[PDB]
Design an enzyme around this catalytic site. Sequence first.
Site: not given
Lengths: 385, 385, 385, 385
Positions: D286, D69, D211, D196
Site C-alpha cells: 500500500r 482490528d 474489494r 468494504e
Amino acid sequence: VKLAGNSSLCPINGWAVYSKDNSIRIGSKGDVFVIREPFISCSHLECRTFFLTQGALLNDKHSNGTVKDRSPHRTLMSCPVGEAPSPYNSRFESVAWSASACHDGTSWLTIGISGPDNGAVAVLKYNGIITDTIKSWRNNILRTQESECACVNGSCFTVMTDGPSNGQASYKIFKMEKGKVVKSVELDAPNYHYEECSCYPNAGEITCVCRDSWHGSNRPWVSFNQNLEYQIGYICSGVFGDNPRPNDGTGSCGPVSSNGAYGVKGFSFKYGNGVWIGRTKSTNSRSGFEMIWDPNGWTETDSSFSVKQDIVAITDWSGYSGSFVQHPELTGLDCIRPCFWVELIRGRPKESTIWTSGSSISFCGVNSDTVGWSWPDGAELPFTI
Amino acid sequence: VKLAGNSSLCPINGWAVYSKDNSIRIGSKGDVFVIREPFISCSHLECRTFFLTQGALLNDKHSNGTVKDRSPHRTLMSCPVGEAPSPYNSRFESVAWSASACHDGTSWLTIGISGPDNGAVAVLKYNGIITDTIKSWRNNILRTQESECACVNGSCFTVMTDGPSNGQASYKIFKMEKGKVVKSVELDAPNYHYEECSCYPNAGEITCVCRDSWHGSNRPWVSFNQNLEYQIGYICSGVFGDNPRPNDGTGSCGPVSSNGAYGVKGFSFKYGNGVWIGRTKSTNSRSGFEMIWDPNGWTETDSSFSVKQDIVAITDWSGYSGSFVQHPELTGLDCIRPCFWVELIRGRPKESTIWTSGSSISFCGVNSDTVGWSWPDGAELPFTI
Amino acid sequence: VKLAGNSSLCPINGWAVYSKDNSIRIGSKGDVFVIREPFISCSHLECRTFFLTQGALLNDKHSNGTVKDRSPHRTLMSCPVGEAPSPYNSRFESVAWSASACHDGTSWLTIGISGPDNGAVAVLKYNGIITDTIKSWRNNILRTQESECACVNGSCFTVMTDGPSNGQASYKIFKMEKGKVVKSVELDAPNYHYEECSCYPNAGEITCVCRDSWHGSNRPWVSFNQNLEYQIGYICSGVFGDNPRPNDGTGSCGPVSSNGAYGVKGFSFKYGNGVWIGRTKSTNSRSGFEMIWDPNGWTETDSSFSVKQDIVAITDWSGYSGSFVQHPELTGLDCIRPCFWVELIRGRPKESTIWTSGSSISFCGVNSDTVGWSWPDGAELPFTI
Amino acid sequence: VKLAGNSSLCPINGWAVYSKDNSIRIGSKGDVFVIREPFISCSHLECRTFFLTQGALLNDKHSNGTVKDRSPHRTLMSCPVGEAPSPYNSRFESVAWSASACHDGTSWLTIGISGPDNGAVAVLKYNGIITDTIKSWRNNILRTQESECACVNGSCFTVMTDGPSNGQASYKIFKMEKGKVVKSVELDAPNYHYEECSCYPNAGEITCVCRDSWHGSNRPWVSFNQNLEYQIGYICSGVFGDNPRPNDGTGSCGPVSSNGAYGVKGFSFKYGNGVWIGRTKSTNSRSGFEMIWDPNGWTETDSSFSVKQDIVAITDWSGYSGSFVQHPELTGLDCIRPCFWVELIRGRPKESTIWTSGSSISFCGVNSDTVGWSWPDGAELPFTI
Ligand SMILES: CCC(CC)O[C@@H]1C=C(C(=O)O)C[C@H](N)[C@H]1NC(C)=O
Ligand SMILES: CCC(CC)O[C@@H]1C=C(C(=O)O)C[C@H](N)[C@H]1NC(C)=O
Ligand SMILES: CCC(CC)O[C@@H]1C=C(C(=O)O)C[C@H](N)[C@H]1NC(C)=O
Ligand SMILES: CCC(CC)O[C@@H]1C=C(C(=O)O)C[C@H](N)[C@H]1NC(C)=O
C-alpha cells in the site's frame, strides 16, 4: 431588549455556593492560563468568568515573575463560569492589564486598559468591535474595576482612577451607551480614595463599594443617578471591611487610617442602613473569607453584627472579591439577585514559587437555607516549576 | 446580504490595540500550531485569524526545519481573533503554502495554493466547497497575498504573482464572484515588482500596497476599478516603507533600488495624498514596528511626516504586517474602518532554534485617543526543542 | 414544551451498546478529569453524561487520595455522551460531592450537594441559576441519587437520604417544579434502607430501585404518584441484585440480610411482575456485569430467570450502574425507552495506585437483536502516577 | 428537506486537493486518537470525517498492539474535515470496529458494529438515538463499508458482508429510512466477493465498487434500484484497481485471480463505459496513490487509459481510499460532485512501532485545472513509543 435596572435587590438570608473552577489544581497538568483579577458577569442568557491572563500557562517557564502586574502580554479573556480558563475554551476580549465588562441586555461591553504607566488607554468594545477610547488624564496608571460594570435602561457605568494609589488621586465615573462614553464626572472627594470599585444596579441607580489603598480600613462608596449625580461616603460599621485592618471596634463615617494603607479589592451590599460585608478572615493578610450581616451598619459605628457565614477558612489563601448581579431578564425573578465571587491567590509573594495565579469561587443571594464552610483553592505548591 | 464597498475609509487619529494572541508563549506548553503568514479578516458578524500551519506543533520534533516555506503538510486554517491557533480551536480551510481569504457578506472565500513549485495550483473555496482553480502560468511558484482579499458589491479581488522574486515577474489581478473567477488582468508593469499585496476596499475601488522584493525600498501599489481597470505606482515618501531599506531621505515615485532587494510584506493606507505607513523600526532586519502619518506622502518625496506611533520596540522581533478592514455592515459605522495586524516571527534564521513560528498583534483605526508602546511576542527561546 | 411522562416502558428483548468513553485509557496522556459517580440523562434534544470530578486530572499529583469521596473541590460537571470528561469539553454544573440531574422538556435541573458532613446542603439549579436549597435534616451526610431524577408532566422527582448508611436512616422523596421543591414526604419505612436510587418515569408514575447498604442483598424499591403517595418493598427474586450478595437461591420480599451489608448503586426495570436486573457478575466484589430477565421475579422468590446477557466479563472491574430513560419527545417512539449505564471503577482500593476514577459504558432498550460481550474499562495500571 | 439523489455525477477533468489533517504529525505531541478506517461524508450543510478510534491516543502506552482490528474499545467518532481527530473536538457516534454513516438531508445515520466475531451486531442510529439493529447472520465477522452510505429520496443504502474474507461469503444490501431497515436483499453472486464497498448515488440509483479479498485483482461492483433490484460485475479494465495486483495487462469481466488474494478498500467512479480509478502506485504494497481515467474501461479489457494524476508518491505509504459525494443541496450545483479520500497508514506491519494509525487526505471532482503531486502522511517514525 435592554436590561431594565429598575428593580431592587432581592431579600436574602445567606449565600449558596454557585461555582468553583479548581483552575490551579487542574493547571498542575492541564493547559490553564496563569491569571489574576478574575470576575463574573452575566447577560440575559449566560454567565461568564472574565480574567486577566499573563499570556502564559501554569507550570511553564513563561509563568516566571507573574507577580508583576502590568505587561504587554496581559490579555482580558473570558470563559463560562466554573470552567478552568484555558486557551481551548477561552474567548479573547481585549489586550489589558486592568479591565471591566458587562452586558446591557443586547451585547457585551468590555473595557481593557493597556499601554505605558504614563499614558495607558482604555479600549472599549461593544460586541467585540472597538467603540471608544479613554486615555490616562493624570499619566499615572489609568485603571478600573477588575469586576463587572453596571447596566441600567441601556446605559452602562464604570469607575476609573488615575494617580497615586499612595495618596490623593483622581476618580471618574463614566456613563456609556453601545460602548461609547456619553458622559463622565470627576468625583469631588478630597481625603477619599477609590480603587477597584464593585458596582451594582439597584432601583435604577448604581452603588459602588471600593478599596481605599491610601488610608482606609473601612471601604469607600459612591452611589449615583443615571445622570451621574452622585453621593460619597465610607461604610460606618466597626466591622472593618478592608485588608489589612484593625481588630473590630468603633468605626467611622470617614477613612479609618489605622492599618488602612494597602487594601484589597472587595464589595458590599447595602440594604437600607444594613450591609452585607464580604471580607478576609485575617486582619494582616489575604487569608480566609466570610460574609457578615450588620443591619444598621452602613450608617452606624456599632462593631456588632447579626449574622456571620464562613466562606474560606482563615487557614487558606484568599484574595480579591467582587459583586456580580443576576437580572430579572435572566432570572425570571422580580428583583436583582446579589452574588459575589472570591479570587484565591496562590504563589508569590506569600509562597515559594516563581509565579502567581488565582482560582475562583462564587456564591449567590438566596432566601432559602445555606451553610458556611471552607471552599479553598486546594492546589499543593510548589509546582514542578 | 452582500457587503457594499461603496463607503470611504474612516477618518482616524491613531491606532488602538485590538488583539494579541501570545501563541508562542502559550505554545511552550500548550498544543499550538507552528505557523507563519497569519492574517485577520472579518465578515458582517465575526473576525477570524487565518494562518498557514506547518502541520506540526510548537516544541515537538515535527517542528524541525519549519523555516522551509513550502511543503505538502502546510495547511491554511483559521480561528477567532486573539486565540492561540490550536488543533482544538482551529477550523481547517485548505491545503496551502500561500493563501488569501475574505468574506463577501454571504460566505467565506478561501484561496489556498499547493503543489510543486513548477506547477502550483490555487484552490478557491466558497463556503468550504471548491468553486474554482487557478494554475501557475509561469511555472515559478504561483503565490498570493498572505492577507485578506477585498470585497465590493459581491465581487472579491486578489492579486497573484508567478515568476522570479528576484527580477521581473508576472502579476495578475483576479475578480471573483461566489468563488469563481469572472475576470482577470495581467499588469503591464515593466520595472515594477508586486508581491504579497495588502488590498482594501475604498469607495467602490480596491487599493493594494505591496512588496518589491526585487529592487524597491519603497512599496509598489495598484488600485483598480470593479472592471479591473487599474493604475500603478510606488509610494513617493522618503519615509521608506520596506525592509531592508536606506535611512529616510529623498524618496521616489518609482522603485528605489538602494537596499530594495529583499523586502517584507507590509501595508499602507492612502488618505488623499497622505499615507499611513506601517513599517519595521529597523533598517536592516525585521525588528520593531511603528505607524507613521505623512500627509502629502503618497505623492511627494518629503522625508518628513507629522505623526509617529510606536507598536513594537526596535529591541523586539517583528515580521510581516497587513491591512484588514471592518465594513459598516459589521460595525454600524458610515465608513470602512482601517485595521492592521503584525506577525511576530520567532526562531530561525535570527535565533538558535530548530523551528520558526509567529505570534500576532492587531490594531484598529479609531478617531479617539491612543498611545504608542511595545507589544512584543514575549516568548523566551530557545525552547525544550 | 414539557416532557409528558404518560407513556409506558417500551417492550424490549435485550440491550444494544450505546456508548463507551474510554476516559481512563485516554487520560493516560490526555487532560481528563478524575471522576466517579457518572450518569447519563437526556432532554428532548440531547444526551449528556454528568459526573462528579475530583477537581483534578488523571496522572497528575492532585489525583492523590481520590478514593476520599467528599471534599470542597468535588464538582458536578457534564459533557456529551461518550466523550472523555475534560476541562476542554465539560460544562460546569454545581459544586457537589453527591448529585442528580434531569431535564423536564424545558431546561436542566441540577442537584448538587456540598458542605460539611454534619450540615450538607443541596443546591438546586434550573437552567443554571439557583432556584432552591435543601439542608441536611439529620446532620449525617445528606446525599442523593448519583443518577438522573425523573420528570413527568413538568414535575421532577428525586430521593434523598440523611443518616447512617450503617443502620436505620431517614429517606425523603422530593417533588419539584422549575427547580423549586413544591412538596416532600418522608418514607415511613422502618427496617428498610434506601440509598442512591435509580428512578424512572412509567405511565405517569415514578419507580425507584435503590441500594440497601445496611442489611439488604436484594434491592429496595419505592414507586409513587405525582402526589408523592408511595408504596415500598424489595425485589423478591432469588436472583439477588446487590453486591456483595449470597449465591442465588430463595429470595424474599424484604431485606435479605445475608451479605447485604455494604452494597453498590444499581438499577432494575419492572415489567408487570418481571424484572430486568443489572448486577455485577461477582458475588464478593464489583467485577463483571450482566443483564438478567426474571419474569415473575419482581413478586416471586424463584431463583430462576429466562434470559441473561453479558455486559462485562467477571475478569474486569465494574462499579455503579444506573437507569436512564429516553422519552418520546426525543425519540419519536410511542413509549419510554429504558437504558442503563455502568461505571467502571479503576484504582484504589482494588489496585495499587494513588488514585480512583471511572470510565463508563451505556446500553439502550431495543426490540431487535443484540449480543452479550465484555466492554471493560481497558486501561492498564498503574499509571506514571 | 431530504436529499434528492435524482441528479447525475458532475463532469470532471481532474482532482483538486480538498483536505489534509496531518493527524499523525500533530499527534507526536498533541492529544490525537489512534485511528484507522477514516472516511468523509457530507450533509446539506457540513462535511465531517468519521473514523474508528482505538480508544487511545498516539504516543501513549495504550496505543500498544493497535494493529489488532477488533476490540471492545474501538469506537466510531467524527469531527470536521481536515482537523486532527482529538478527544477535544470529536463527537462520539457509536461503539464499533466496523462502520458506515451518511446524512439523508434531515439527520445523520450512523452504523456501528461491535460484539464478538461469532455474533457481531450493527447498531443503527438516526440523529444519535438507536433506531434499529442488525445481527450477524453467518456468525463470521459481520462487517460493512468503512466509508459513507448512499442516500436517495430519503432512503439510505449500505452493503454488509458476513462470512470468510477468504472464500465465498454472504453479501447483503440494506435499504433504510430514518435509520430503520425497510428492505434487504442477499446478493446471488457465486464466485464474486464483496467487501468494504464504496457506494455513491447517481441518477436515483446506487453504484458500489468494492474489494475482492478472495480472488480479485480487479474490483467487484453492484449497482441497484431504490427497490434493491441489482446488477453485478467486475471492472473490466486491464488497469487493475486492487492491491496487490499484477502488472497492467489484459483484464477480465470477472475475478482476475492472479494476485487477487488480499486486497485493500478502494473506490471507482463510473461515467458511461469509462472509469475514474483510484489505486495504489505499488503492485505489492500500500504505497503511493494515483487517479486514472480509462474511458471504455468499465466494459473493456484495454490496459490503456487516457489520463493519470499523481496523488501520493510510490515512495510513501498509503492505505484505504473511498468515495464520498457532495449533493446539490449543499453545493448549489446541478449535479452530484464526486470526491474521494485516502487513508495514509503509518506503523505496523510495515514499520517498527508498537502501534498503527492513519492520516487522511481528500480531493474533489472539479471541471477546472488541477495538478498531480505527492501529499504524503509526513510523520517521522518511530515515535517516543
Ligand atoms: C496600581 C495601584 C493598584 C491599586 C492599589 O494596584 C493593584 C493592586 C493589586 C493587588 O493589591 O493585588 C494588583 C492589581 N493588578 C493592581 N492594579 C494594577 C492596574 O496594577
Ligand atoms: C517565493 C518568493 C516569496 C516572495 C518573496 O517568498 C515569500 C517570502 C517570505 C518571507 O520573506 O518571509 C516567506 C513566504 N512564505 C514566501 N512565500 C512562499 C510562497 O514561499
Ligand atoms: C455516605 C454513604 C454512601 C452510600 C452508602 O456512600 C457512598 C458509597 C460509595 C461507594 O460505595 O462506592 C462512594 C460514594 N461517593 C458514597 N457517597 C458519598 C456522599 O460519600
Ligand atoms: C475481517 C475481514 C476484513 C476484510 C478482509 O478485514 C479487514 C481488513 C483490514 C486491512 O486489510 O487493512 C483491516 C480492517 N479493519 C478489517 N476489517 C475488520 C472488521 O476487521
